[PDB]
Amino acid sequence: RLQQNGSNIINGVNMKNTVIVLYFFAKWCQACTMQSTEMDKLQKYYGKRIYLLKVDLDKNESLARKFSVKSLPTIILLKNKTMLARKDHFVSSNDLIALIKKH
Numbered sequence: 001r002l003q004q005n006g007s008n009i010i011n012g013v014n015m016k017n018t019v020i021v022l023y024f025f026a027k028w029c030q031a032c033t034m035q036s037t038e039m040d041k042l043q044k045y046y047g048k049r050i051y052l053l054k055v056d057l058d059k060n061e062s063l064a065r066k067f068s069v070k071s072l073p074t075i076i077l078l079k080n081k082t083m084l085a086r087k088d089h090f091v092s093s094n095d096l097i098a099l100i101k102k103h
Contacts, residue, residue: 010081012051017080019100020051024067024074026058031090035073041093050100079103 005014012020023039025032036054043052057064057072067076075091077084077100085099 019079022053022076032073038093
């Protein structure tokens, strides 16, 4: 059971090739709460055209460390396991759309 799986996206294994939005955050972090609100709009607009992965840094230093997060919020965009863009501070959903919509 739980057997190991293949890649269509390296982070989300065994499913699909879409644009995943990896967002690092912390509950205590005020700068984030404003962004999370943004992600909600972003999620609604793109629906399933993208996948949002929200990461709580407080619970995964391992990963943040791997991705070298130096601030919150951090937003990284990946398609086909190649980083498309990165933001190390707040971005608007509208801004997010624009960057995303390149692809």
